[PDB]
Amino acid sequence: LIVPYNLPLPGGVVPRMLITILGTVKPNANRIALDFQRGNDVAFHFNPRFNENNRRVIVCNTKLDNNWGREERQSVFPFESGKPFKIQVLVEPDHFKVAVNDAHLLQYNHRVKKLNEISKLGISGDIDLTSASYTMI
Numbered sequence: 450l451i452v453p454y455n456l457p458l459p460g461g462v463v464p465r466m467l468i469t470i471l472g473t474v475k476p477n478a479n480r481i482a483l484d485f486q487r488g489n490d491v492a493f494h495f496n497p498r499f500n501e502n503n504r505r506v507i508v509c510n511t512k513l514d515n516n517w518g519r520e521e522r523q524s525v526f527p528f529e530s531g532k533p534f535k536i537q538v539l540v541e542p543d544h545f546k547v548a549v550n551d552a553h554l555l556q557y558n559h560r561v562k563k564l565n566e567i568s569k570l571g572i573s574g575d576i577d578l579t580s581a582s583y584t585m586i
């Protein structure tokens with residue numbers, strides 16, 4: 450699975466939909482990014498950064514009209530350089546549920562209301578990708 454990787458989401462994102470991304474973080478990693486896309490806009494951007502002011506942080510944002518909105522930041526960082534990870538993204542009708550390494554990490558309230566229109570997920574950054582699928586729960 451070649452990074453940058455695109456995972457098509459036919460029908461779009463829909464409540465009860467569970468996205469599982471398995472992979473490994475590369476050594477001396479700087480950044481990782483998941484991008485739930487609605488055209489040229491990014492509905493949900495999940496962005497672990499490993500060195501921002503000598504600190505590790507997860508930045509979440511929405512890009513509407515080539516402009517990034519309000520940053521949602523999480524200090525809780527479950528990723529490590531040269532270590533495998535499991536990211537699980539559950540779609541609910543009120544928020545995105547993000548779990549990493551089988552423990553809930555963050556919630557991301559839907560800025561884009563047209564969930565049937567979010568038809569693509571992009572996996573990019575400093576990672577070796579093992580598995581990318583989705584199913585209903």
Ligand SMILES: OC[C@H]1O[C@@H](S[C@@H]2O[C@H](CO)[C@H](O)[C@H](n3cc(-c4cccc(F)c4)nn3)[C@H]2O)[C@H](O)[C@@H](n2cc(-c3cccc(F)c3)nn2)[C@H]1O
Binds near residue numbers: 480502508520522573
């Ligand atoms: O919003 C998310 C976007 O962020 C900008 S960096 C952004 O730059 C702005 C410049 O005006 C501000 O500085 C903003 N900022 C910093 C703080 C702060 C700083 C410290 C502490 C603290 F409290 C607060 N508050 N606001 C920065 O986060 C990235 O380029 C962008 N992006 C990344 C990628 C990308 C491409 C390929 C791979 C990949 F992983 C990511 N492709 N687009 C995306 O991640």
Ligand SMILES: [Cl-]
Binds near residue numbers: 496498
């Ligand atoms: Cl970045």
